[PDB]
Amino acid sequence: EYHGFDAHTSENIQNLARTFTHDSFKNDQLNPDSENFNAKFWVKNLRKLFESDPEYYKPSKLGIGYRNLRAYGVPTVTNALWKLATEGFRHFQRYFDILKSMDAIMRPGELTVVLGRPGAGCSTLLKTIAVNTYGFHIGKESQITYDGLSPHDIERHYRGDVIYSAETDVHFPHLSVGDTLEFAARLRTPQNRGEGIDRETYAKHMASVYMATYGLSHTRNTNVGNDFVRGVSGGERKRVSIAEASLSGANIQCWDNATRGLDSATALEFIRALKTSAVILDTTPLIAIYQCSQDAYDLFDKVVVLYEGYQIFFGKATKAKEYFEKMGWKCPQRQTTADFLTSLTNPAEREPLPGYEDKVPRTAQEFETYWKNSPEYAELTKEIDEYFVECERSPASPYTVSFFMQVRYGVARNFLRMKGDPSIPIFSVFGQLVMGLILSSVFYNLSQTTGSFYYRGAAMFFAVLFNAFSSLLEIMSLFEARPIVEKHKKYALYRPSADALASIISELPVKLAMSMSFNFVFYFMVNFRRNPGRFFFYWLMCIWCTFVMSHLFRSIGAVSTSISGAMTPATVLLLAMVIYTGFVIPTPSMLGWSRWINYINPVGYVFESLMVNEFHGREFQCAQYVPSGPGYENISRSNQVCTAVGSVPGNEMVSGTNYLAGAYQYYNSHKWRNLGITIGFAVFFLAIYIALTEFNKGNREIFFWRDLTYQVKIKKEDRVILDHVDGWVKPGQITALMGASGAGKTTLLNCLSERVTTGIITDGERLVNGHALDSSFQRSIGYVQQQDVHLETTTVREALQFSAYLRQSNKISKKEKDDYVDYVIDLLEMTDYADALVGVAGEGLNVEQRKRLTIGVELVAKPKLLLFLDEPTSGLDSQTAWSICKLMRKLADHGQAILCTIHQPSALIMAEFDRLLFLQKGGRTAYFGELGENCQTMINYFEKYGADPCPKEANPAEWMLQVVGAAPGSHAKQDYFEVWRNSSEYQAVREEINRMEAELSKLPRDNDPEALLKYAAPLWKQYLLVSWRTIVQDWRSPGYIYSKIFLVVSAALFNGFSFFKAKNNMQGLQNQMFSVFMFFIPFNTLVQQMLPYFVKQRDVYEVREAPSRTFSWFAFIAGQITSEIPYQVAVGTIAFFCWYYPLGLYNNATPTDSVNPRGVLMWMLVTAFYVYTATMGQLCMSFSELADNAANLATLLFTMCLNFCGVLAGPDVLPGFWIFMYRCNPFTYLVQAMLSTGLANTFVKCAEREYVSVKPPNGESCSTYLDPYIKFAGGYFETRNDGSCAFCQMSSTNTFLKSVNSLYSERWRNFGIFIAFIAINIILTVIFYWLARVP
C-alpha cells in the first residue's frame, strides 16, 4: 500500500537516480553512489537544477495571503417558448452574498483543510483562491496576494501554477499511467538550451521519479481506466491525478470533495499523498472535505472553519478544538475533532457546556464576532499584514514549449491513443470497404451506350456522398477528448488550437486508408473512364471533397455538446447541400429562389468537376433511336435520332459534351476552377474550426434464519461465501450488519432478500414465524438500494403514487392509496418539496432528499415483513448520515423491522442501532447481539474473551474491526469464529431461535390469496400506467419534442419548396422521385434523438423496478412501443402538410377528380413511414446495450434498404443476387405507393431542351411518319415550321411509373404490405427484448 514516502521509496528513487546518472555518464547530497544521499533533496533539485534556467521570472513555490475577501453573486414543452422569450428579454436588459469578510495566509509546504457543512461556501472559497471566480465577483476592498503577485498576474501570465480540480478525474481511459505522466513531463520540460542533457531521457526520469514518489510505480503499463473502462483502482486514479497536477508545475492546488465516494482506507491515502507533495515538493494543497477521520485530520497543518459563509476560525489544526472548547462547547466522547467542528454549526448538535449555556454564540454573526474579538484573530491579522508588507517591499505565454512542439506531442499522444484502442479505425475502414463494395455491386459494369447516362449520373452522385460523410464519426473523438483538453489548457500545457491541429494531422493516415479502400474498388467495379489520368483526377477531387467535409463537420462540432444536439440543426444544412449537389435538381430545373445555394455549395463544384471529367470529349453509342418498331423495319439512319438530351438527328453516336451542356449545364472550362474553389472552401472551414476551438470554449410477522450457508462457483471451484450464519429481526429494532471487505455482508443481505443471481444454499433455512418462505415473501419486504434510481421528470408525489398504485393490493381504492402517499410524505418530512421535480443530481433534489424519496418509494408499497437497507449512510456527510439514522429510528419507533448494512460508521451513528451482526472474512459471524449503550455491550464481549481494552476515545467500529484483524496492519490473537461458536452467547441465540420456531408456529396464519400473486396489478393496468408515464416523461423532456418538431418541419419545408410546383416534364418526374427518396433522410437523426430516452427508461426499470416486481417486462416493452406512436403520428401529419402541398401534387389528381382519396392515402403513407421509423429504432435498440451501437445498426439497415429500394436501379438492372433484397425491402412498397399516389394519371409536357428533332422522309409529313410509332409507344410531336418534328417520348406519367415498376392499381396493396412490416418490427421487439435482457 501507500504509506507516504517511506525509506524503501527513497531507495527506489536512489536506484532511479543511479540509473539516470549512469545513462548520461557515457555535491555529496546529490551523488547517488556516495553515502548519505537523501532522495528528498534529489527530487527537489530535479525540478530546478539539471535544466536550463530562463531569465524570465518563474516561481518555484507560491503562497496566498488575503484580507477582507468577500464574494457575492446574483417546465413542460408548451411553456418553453414563454420561458425562452422571458430569458431573451432579461438578456436584452439584488445582491446575494456568499462569502463574507475573511482573512487568511497559506504558506508553501502547508496542507490546509476547509471544514464546514454543505452549502457553507467551502467550494466558493477554494474557487476564489484558485482565481476561478467565474460565476460571481469579489469585492474591490479585498486585498489578495500570491507571494507578491496579483490575482490577474496569476490569471493571465502565471496560469497553471494555481490549479483547481474538484470531483471528476478526466483522463484518457485507454492511455497507460506511464504514458499519461510522460506526456505531462515532456510538455512541461523547457527546451531553451538542451546541451548537456537529453530532454527525452530527462522527462522519462522525472516521470519515473514522480511515479515513485506517489506510489504509482506498480501501475506503470496499466490503463488509467474510467468508471466504464477497467483499469487502475479508484484510489489510484486520484493519486494519478495528483501526480499529473504536480508534474505539470502546480504550486497551489485546490480540491473540493476529491475524496467523495471513497472509503477511509483510500481517503487516508489521498490525504497522505497530498501531505507528501506538500512536504517534499513544497506545494500548497488546500482540500475541502466533509467526512474526515481522526487519522486523516492528524495530517492537516491548518484549518479554516466556515459557518454559512462566515470564517469562524483559522489557525493550526491542533488548536481549533481547544479554541472552541474555551468558547463554551462540550465535545461528546468518541467524536473526531473534524466532526466536532462541523457539528458546531448544527443547532440539533452542538450541546453547550454546563454553566456556559447562557454565554455562547448561537448564530453565525455571533460566532464571527467572537472570532474577530479573540486574540487569535489579532495575531493572524498582524502576521498577514507583516506578510503583505514583506511581499510589497520585494512571461506573456504561460505555456512552456513552442506551438510546433505542442502539435508534435499532441500528434504523438493521438497515435498512442489510437494504438491503445485500434477498434475505431479498423471498424471505419472495414465498413467503408464493405459498403463501397455493396454500393458498387448495384452499379456494376455500367455500359458504354446512352442507357447508362442516368446511372453514370447516379453513381458519381453517390461516390461524392460516400466521400462526403466518410469522416462523420471522427466528430466523436472531439467530444471524448474535450474535457481533457480544457483541463490541460487550465494547466498551461498546450493551447486548444494546437490540439485541434494535432487531431487533424493524426487521422490523415485513416483518411487515406478509407479513401483508397473505397475509391479504388468503386471507380473500377463501376465502369468509369479507364484512363489513369482520369482516375487520378477523380481521386484528387474526392480527397479534397472529404477534406472540405471533415473540416465543416469539425467546425459544426466545435460549438456543440452532443452528437444529437449537433445533428438536429446540422441535418437541415447537410440535406440542403445534398439536394443542391447538382444531381437531384439539375441546374436547369433549379428554381430562382434557390439558384444562389448552388453557388455557395462546396459539393456542387466537386460534382461538376467529376461529371466533366467523366463525360467531356466522349462518344456514346446510341441505344434507342426514337422512330423504330414493327412499323419501321428498314429506314435510313438520317431520319432517325437518338433519345438523349444532346442527341443530333442522323447521328449514330451522342457526344458527352452536348449531354453535359444540355442536361446539367456543365462545361470543361470549370474542370480546374472548381478544384481551386474546393481548396479555398477547405482552407476557410479549417480556419473557422481552429478559431472556434480557440475562442468558443469554456409488522406482526417475524423473519429469521438458521445455519445459512451459501457457496458460489469461482474458477470451476466451489467457494463458501456464507458459513452457518443465523439471526433474526423484530419489529421496533434496528439490526446493523457489518463486516470487513471480504465478510460478505452485502452477499448476506442479498441472499436474505432473494436478490442473488447465482449460488446455492446448502445447510440453512429462512423462516417466518417458523413457516418456510412461500411465493408471497418477495412482495412482503422492502429493499432500499444504495443508489437512487429515479426518473428525472417525475415529481416526488408522482414518483410515490406510481409505486403505491402498482405495488398495493387491488382491493384498496385509489383514494386510500393517495391517503397513504400523503401519510408517508408527512412522515418523511417532504411536504416542502412534494411537487418538486426529481431532476438530475446537479439540478434538483440533493442527496438527502433523493435518499428520502428512495425510502418513501418502498414505504408506500406497505411492506409487511422487513425493510432491508443497503448502506443507507454510505456516501453521505456526517450531518446527512445523522439525519438518515434519525429517520430510520423514527420508522422503527412506528413498528417497522429494519435490517441495514452499515459500512464504516462513526461512534455516534453506531450508537443509534439496537442490534449488531458482525461478520468475519469468509462469512463467519464473530458477534451477534445487542450492542447496548455507546456500543458498550459489544465492547464488554471481546474484552471478556481475551481482547485489548478499547480506548476511551476510539471509535468502537474501528476497534472491533482491528480486534479480529480485519483492518490493515492489525494482528488478530485468534480467530473469533471459534470463540463465538462456544461462548454462552451463541447458545443464547440458538435457544432463542429454537423457542421462536417452536412457539410462533402455533399462531394462526393470515392466508391472503392476493398475497400469493407475482404482481399486484393486472397486466392491462401496468401497461396503461407505464405507457402514460413514458408519454408524460417524453412531453416534459427539455428539448426533445421540440427537437423532433424542428428537424422534421425544417426538412419537410426545405424539400417541399425546393421542388415547389414541380413541372411534369421528363426531368421533373425524376426530380420528384428523388424528392420522395430524400424525404426519408431524417430517419437517422430521429433514431439518434429517440434512443437515449429509451436508455434511461430501460436503466430505471432493470436496475430497480425489475427486482422489485413493480411490473412485468411485457408491460415495460409494450409501454415503450406505445409511448412513441402519438408523437410520430403528429410529426408525420405535420411533415405531410409541409411537403405534399408545396410540391403541388394535388394538381395531379384534379383531372381524374380524385384529390381527396389520394391526399388521404399520402397522409397515411407518411404517418406510417414515421411510425415505422420509431418501431425500427426500438427494434434495433431492443437487443443492444449501448445506444450508439443501436443507432449505427439502424443507420446501416436503413442504408441497405434505401440502396435496393428500386430508385437507384430497378430489378431488371439489379444483379440476380440482390433481387431478394429488393423483395424483402420495406421501402420498395412505400416508394411505389407514394410515387403512384402522387404522380399517376396526368399529362407530361417536355421542356425545350428535351425535344428530339426528327427529320421526316422526303415527301412526307410529321403525322403520317410518326403516328404508327405513337401508337406503338407514347409521346407527341410538334411542327417547328422548318420541316422537322420536335418529338417528346412521354405523354403520360404512367409510362414513367411503369419504368420505375410503380403501378397506380397496386397502391393500396403496397400500403398494406408496408403496414405488415411495421407489425413485424413490433413483434420482433417484444421477442428480442425477452431474449437479450429478461433473465
Ligand SMILES: CCCCC/C=C/C/C=C/C/C=C/C/C=C/CCCC(=O)OC[C@H](COP(=O)(O)O[C@H]1[C@H](O)[C@H](O)[C@H](OP(=O)(O)O)[C@@H](OP(=O)(O)O)[C@@H]1O)OC(=O)CCCCCCCCCCCCCCCCC
Ligand atoms: C495534405 C493534403 C493532401 C492532399 C493530396 C495532394 C494532392 C496534390 C497533387 C498534386 C498533383 C497536381 C497535378 C496537376 C497537374 C495536372 C496536369 C494536367 C493538366 C491538363 O490540363 O490536362 C488535361 C487532361 C484532360 O483534359 P480534357 O480531356 O478534359 O480537355 C483538354 C484536353 O486534355 C487536351 O489536352 C486539350 O487541352 P491542353 O492541350 O492539355 O491544354 C483540350 O482538348 P479538347 O478540349 O479539344 O478536348 C482540352 O483542354 O488531363 C488528363 O487527361 C489526365 C491528367 C492527370 C489529371 C490530374 C493529375 C492527377 C493528380 C495527381 C495525383 C492525385 C492525388 C495524389 C495522391 C493522393 C493521396 C496521396
Ligand SMILES: OC(Cn1cncn1)(Cn1cncn1)c1ccc(F)cc1F
Ligand atoms: O450515406 C448515404 C449514401 N450512401 C452510402 N452508401 C449508399 N448510399 C446513405 N444513407 C445514410 N443514411 C441514409 N442513407 C447518404 C448520406 C447522406 C444523404 F443525405 C443521403 C444518403 F443517401
